[PDB]
Amino acid sequence: YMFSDRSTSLSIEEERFLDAAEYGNIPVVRKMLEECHSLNVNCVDYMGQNALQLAVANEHLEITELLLKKENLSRVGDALLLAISKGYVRIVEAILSHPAFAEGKRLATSPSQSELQQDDFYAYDEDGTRFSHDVTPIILAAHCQEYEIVHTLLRKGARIERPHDYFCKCNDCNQKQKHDSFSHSRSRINAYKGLASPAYLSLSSEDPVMTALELSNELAVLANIEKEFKNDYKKLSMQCKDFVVGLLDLCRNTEEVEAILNGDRQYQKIMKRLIKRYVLQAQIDKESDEVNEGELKEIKQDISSLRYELLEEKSQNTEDLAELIRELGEKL
Amino acid sequence: YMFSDRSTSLSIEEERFLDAAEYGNIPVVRKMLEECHSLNVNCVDYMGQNALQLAVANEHLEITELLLKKENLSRVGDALLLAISKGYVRIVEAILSHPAFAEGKRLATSPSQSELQQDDFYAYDEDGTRFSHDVTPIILAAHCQEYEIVHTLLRKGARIERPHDYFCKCNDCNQKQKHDSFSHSRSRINAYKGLASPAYLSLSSEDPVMTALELSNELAVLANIEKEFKNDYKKLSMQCKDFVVGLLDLCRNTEEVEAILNGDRQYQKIMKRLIKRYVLQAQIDKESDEVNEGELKEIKQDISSLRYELLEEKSQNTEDLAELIRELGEKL
Amino acid sequence: YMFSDRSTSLSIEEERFLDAAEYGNIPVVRKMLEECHSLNVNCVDYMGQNALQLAVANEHLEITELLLKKENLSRVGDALLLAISKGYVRIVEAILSHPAFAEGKRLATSPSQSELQQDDFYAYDEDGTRFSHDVTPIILAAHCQEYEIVHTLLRKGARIERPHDYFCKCNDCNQKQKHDSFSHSRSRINAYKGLASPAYLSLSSEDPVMTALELSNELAVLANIEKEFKNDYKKLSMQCKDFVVGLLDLCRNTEEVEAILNGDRQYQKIMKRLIKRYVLQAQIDKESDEVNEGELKEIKQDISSLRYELLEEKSQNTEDLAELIRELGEKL
Amino acid sequence: YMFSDRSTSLSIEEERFLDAAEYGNIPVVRKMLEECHSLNVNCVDYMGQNALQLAVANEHLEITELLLKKENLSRVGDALLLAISKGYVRIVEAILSHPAFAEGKRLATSPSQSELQQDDFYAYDEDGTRFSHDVTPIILAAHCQEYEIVHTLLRKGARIERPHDYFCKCNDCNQKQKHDSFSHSRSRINAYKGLASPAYLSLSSEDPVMTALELSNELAVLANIEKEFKNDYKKLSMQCKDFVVGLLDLCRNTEEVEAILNGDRQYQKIMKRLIKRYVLQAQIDKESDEVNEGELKEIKQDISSLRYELLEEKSQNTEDLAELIRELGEKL
């Protein structure tokens, strides 16, 4: 009558490996990755998550690099999605060095259809995604509003494609509408929430005030036309108006105020100054929010990882050294 | 006129051992457990708590394993109850390797009556329990709503037995009613709060929506019938309705919505997907609560434990090494 | 025009010593305490506080023990008051091993008058106290409501003496009234706030319900009689009523409820059980408050202390070892 | 279409150096500063910030001292402004040992005009300041209300010059008014907010009650006269009234109350006592605010810095030692 995902009982090797991957015990993971050639690294815990997922979820960077050194690894895309969703920057910039993300071939790609074609890349528990099918890395990065990850995914040449019209009549949109209505509406609202984020507006365009105003008007039209999610499509336009008002408020000089209120070389330079000012201001105001439990969980896990590394390092130190002095003590 | 539990004044050995067990000083606890054969490990502090209780209450895993290596230890069940009540996962999974919990013979057992028979296992200060007598580990795990501990205690084959009817007329229930009324009503409301937790509902049944609805109706009937705790029995049914509404809200596909709203292979697979989705969502929303003082207390105690371990380890390192180079310096 | 307490500019020795005492740099403090015989350990910072005060204020236990090894130290009583006011338990139990607190001769002593006689023990900046003159350690411990410190100061045989009547007519009270009115009223309200704390009520008497009720009635009489602080004297009686209601609420058995509501061997045992239950419950509810900045300041200072200790320890390690291998490399 | 400040793609040397400066990896920064003579230390990240700015923004003191050992460094004044704005005390007291702040020649200097003359000292991204041009270090220290930094900048002999009259008619004020109106009004309100801070009032004058009252009346006059920012000029006067009321509330003796309410040797001593009492009280009440995310970011970065230092130190330890025992093992 029990709910258990792992139907097969877990061996002692997989148990020590998964607790070591959960609590960042780096050197015994090195030992298990080297000496044990019967160690299935695609093992799952009681919930059904991989050692890479357990390593990413607790912010251990070193074991994530060490696991990415292996090549039989799976569910890497969901590890990237989880690291974006919690906002671990170095884990994202280490996962993006995997060969599956070499040319950007999986980051935000509409010609390789994620929802229509069973690509099966972003997946966990071989049965479904951790988010919607329409959610791609840069959409989730815009949803979580973390600026360094958005800039890294933009430097990889991945962007958010604007959704189609409310009645586009092309057979792709008609087929995606006919297969599921609620999923299609959720895809549209998720892509528009990704488009209306201050991170993507600040880092993706060249005239962010113009793009923000056009998006606000377009979201108001899709608000009053569409009946499902009729209020959230107005909240996104309110977020765009909030973004352009925050750009107005961060101006110091009267030249900056006139450059925003006019919009029209010099304008490119003053917009590149104001975008940087707004990014640093929003970074401070994200650093001035109250503290949730997950950050202390990260700190306690990093402390335990430090404990394991230092204890084993000094133990292997005294063994490797006392061997070489034992050779003396026997030799002399 | 002073209140003091330990009537006997504490020796210097017991003082150093209890401060070392309070602040996680691992190696001097190893030294006191080895070199001192007159060390009563059942010593109590000023409050009256054991070294195992002081070690569990501050989250020191290593000294908890080290104390469980000993065999004259007492009050292990209350250490398990305290580790469940604060939610230390590794301490629970290390305490459950003790031989008193080998076959599950003490976890959630109604044929071995905890309230009626003086089992005296879950006890502190030889005079009473840290909770009610009806509180067993999985009931407290459902009360604290921690999912990994509930899954571990369920894998041990322990479950919450449903309480009897409001007038069962069997002589066990009549005797437990005649011995104490307030204690019996508290036992009933504690067991029903354990049954209505989202952790036990999500991890214990096969059709959680059906069990949640049946429990909500049963709790509404026991709400309007019983006069004592007349509102809390409605709050539990409101929690069950909140649980089934949260399951409805976490659906993505229209197939998932239809699978919840109908209830009737494919349904087993879609329920095993939705239960995992709800578990991960509730884990995130538990990780998004504000921070209390006890977590920082845990972090400071782990930092002090790390300090003691590293300082003594490098000190014993330089002594063990400088001895072997002193043998040279005298020999050559 | 500048405000500066230290009129004499600070030498480089005193500067390195005071920054090392501020940030817990243990080994350079050992070096400065040993090799420098011209080091005035009563030096003050820019504010005017001693190295012991700076060491206590940031929770460094090791340098506090090291400074208490010295004997020319001053302002120890204010260090005890500061450690009580922030609630550092081990620093208090280490400061109470100083010879000035050997027999309890300074803890809570009315025959050695603190306000009338210029004892000059609890002092900083040679001009005044960090609190009122009537504030003694156990009064401040009752004000901060920390239970372990109250129990430690009670085991030292220090207690809070009840203030006199509103018109006592003894020449001591008349003289203390004639010297200052506002100071005398503040002394009375501070001593009554110390008497009405749940810590002192729970740890100081044998029948806490009777003492709490008598104190609540006495505080209501002094509320309606006295005009100055007319509402706070009612808030203390409300705190006493809150304490006895919390004792009523923590009862499990009907025997415990009847033992509270009656008050009259068996009653001594059941009160010693309920007092322990209330102490543990209030300790949990103190550990369930939100987090202030000072705890993170303590954690960051302990981290920096750990960094300094480990870095210097491994540096002195490699020097002490490489000397003894250099003797070889030159000898062979 | 991408927004990127660093138009030149970053080399692998600059990448390893900037990630090492971001996450406090001290020894590889030592290695890159020594062995690489083609390392442009004025490199910028994706945002456009220097290695000194990235090192200051995450509170790494050791790499900040190490970078200040170099002499081709730029944007030091904005590093000082950032360290003041986040309130890192040791980083400020280490940056003020740079030769650009030797005699106080850049701290708060009106004869060397910061807004009128293009001094280009406090700058980032070669295009603008992180704050207004009128913002100098002690004005920002008064804005952030951190007392140790205000005292350090006051001991450097830097002060806040009072702004001119609302119509001063001198050609400097007329020219600064004619060049920009909004910038001039922002400069006036920023300087008056710096003057009305409790830190500058408590640490800069000799009779703080008189200065606070004169400033409150002057700010009320500039409130009712000036139309722009008409309410904030009243909020500053309300802050001055709050400051003098807090000084009244912190009095213990009736002599202290009479010394405040009169204002008129003995008065100098009692004001020097009350100013110290208010400073310590405001320091406690700043340490009793809720916790934001940036403090945990500082703690996690210090933990990672400790990890890097200890791991490399023990690695270089075992290499340097095993070389000298290898010389033996080959020699004997």
Short mmCIF file of N, CA, C and O in Angstrom, two decimals, chain A residues 252-255 257-258, chain D residues 166 173-189 228-229:
data_model
loop_
_atom_site.label_atom_id
_atom_site.label_comp_id
_atom_site.label_asym_id
_atom_site.label_seq_id
_atom_site.Cartn_x
_atom_site.Cartn_y
_atom_site.Cartn_z
N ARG A 252 19.03 60.51 -12.92
CA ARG A 252 19.58 61.58 -12.10
C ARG A 252 19.52 62.91 -12.83
O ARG A 252 18.93 63.88 -12.33
N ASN A 253 20.12 62.98 -14.01
CA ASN A 253 20.19 64.22 -14.76
C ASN A 253 18.85 64.49 -15.45
O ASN A 253 18.06 63.59 -15.71
N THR A 254 18.62 65.77 -15.74
CA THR A 254 17.46 66.15 -16.53
C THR A 254 17.61 65.69 -17.98
O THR A 254 16.60 65.47 -18.67
N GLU A 255 18.85 65.53 -18.44
CA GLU A 255 19.10 64.94 -19.75
C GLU A 255 18.60 63.50 -19.81
O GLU A 255 18.04 63.08 -20.83
N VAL A 257 16.09 62.25 -17.99
CA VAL A 257 14.64 62.30 -17.98
C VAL A 257 14.11 62.68 -19.36
O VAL A 257 13.13 62.10 -19.85
N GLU A 258 14.78 63.62 -20.02
CA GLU A 258 14.36 64.03 -21.35
C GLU A 258 14.65 62.94 -22.37
O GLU A 258 13.92 62.79 -23.36
N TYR D 166 18.80 79.31 -0.22
CA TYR D 166 17.90 78.99 -1.31
C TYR D 166 18.05 79.95 -2.48
O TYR D 166 17.70 79.59 -3.61
N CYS D 173 26.96 78.97 -7.19
CA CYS D 173 25.63 78.41 -7.00
C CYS D 173 24.71 78.74 -8.17
O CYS D 173 23.89 77.91 -8.57
N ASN D 174 24.85 79.94 -8.75
CA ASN D 174 24.05 80.30 -9.91
C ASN D 174 24.42 79.46 -11.12
O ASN D 174 23.55 79.06 -11.90
N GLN D 175 25.71 79.16 -11.28
CA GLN D 175 26.15 78.34 -12.40
C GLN D 175 25.70 76.89 -12.23
O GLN D 175 25.26 76.24 -13.19
N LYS D 176 25.78 76.38 -11.00
CA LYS D 176 25.32 75.02 -10.74
C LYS D 176 23.80 74.92 -10.85
O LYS D 176 23.26 73.85 -11.16
N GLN D 177 23.09 76.03 -10.61
CA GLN D 177 21.65 76.05 -10.81
C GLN D 177 21.30 76.15 -12.29
O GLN D 177 20.30 75.57 -12.73
N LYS D 178 22.11 76.87 -13.06
CA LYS D 178 21.80 77.09 -14.47
C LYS D 178 22.14 75.87 -15.30
O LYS D 178 21.49 75.60 -16.32
N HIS D 179 23.16 75.11 -14.90
CA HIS D 179 23.53 73.91 -15.63
C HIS D 179 22.48 72.81 -15.49
O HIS D 179 22.18 72.13 -16.48
N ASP D 180 21.91 72.64 -14.30
CA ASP D 180 20.89 71.63 -14.06
C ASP D 180 20.07 71.97 -12.82
O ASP D 180 20.64 72.31 -11.78
N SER D 181 18.75 71.89 -12.93
CA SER D 181 17.89 72.23 -11.80
C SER D 181 17.61 71.01 -10.93
O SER D 181 17.72 71.07 -9.70
N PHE D 182 17.23 69.90 -11.57
CA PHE D 182 16.92 68.68 -10.85
C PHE D 182 18.14 68.12 -10.14
O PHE D 182 18.04 67.66 -8.99
N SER D 183 19.31 68.18 -10.79
CA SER D 183 20.55 67.74 -10.16
C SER D 183 20.92 68.62 -8.98
O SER D 183 21.39 68.11 -7.95
N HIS D 184 20.67 69.92 -9.08
CA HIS D 184 20.98 70.82 -7.97
C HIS D 184 20.06 70.58 -6.79
O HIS D 184 20.51 70.58 -5.64
N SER D 185 18.78 70.34 -7.05
CA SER D 185 17.84 70.07 -5.96
C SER D 185 18.14 68.73 -5.31
O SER D 185 18.02 68.57 -4.09
N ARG D 186 18.55 67.74 -6.12
CA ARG D 186 18.93 66.45 -5.57
C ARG D 186 20.20 66.55 -4.73
O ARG D 186 20.33 65.88 -3.71
N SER D 187 21.12 67.42 -5.14
CA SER D 187 22.33 67.65 -4.36
C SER D 187 22.01 68.28 -3.02
O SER D 187 22.56 67.90 -1.99
N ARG D 188 21.09 69.26 -3.03
CA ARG D 188 20.70 69.91 -1.78
C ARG D 188 20.01 68.94 -0.84
O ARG D 188 20.32 68.90 0.36
N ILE D 189 19.09 68.12 -1.36
CA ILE D 189 18.36 67.22 -0.47
C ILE D 189 19.26 66.08 0.00
O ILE D 189 19.13 65.61 1.14
N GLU D 228 9.63 71.77 -4.57
CA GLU D 228 10.13 70.45 -4.92
C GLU D 228 10.65 69.76 -3.67
O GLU D 228 11.35 70.37 -2.86
N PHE D 229 10.29 68.47 -3.53
CA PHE D 229 10.60 67.65 -2.36
C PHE D 229 10.07 68.30 -1.08
O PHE D 229 10.78 68.37 -0.07
#
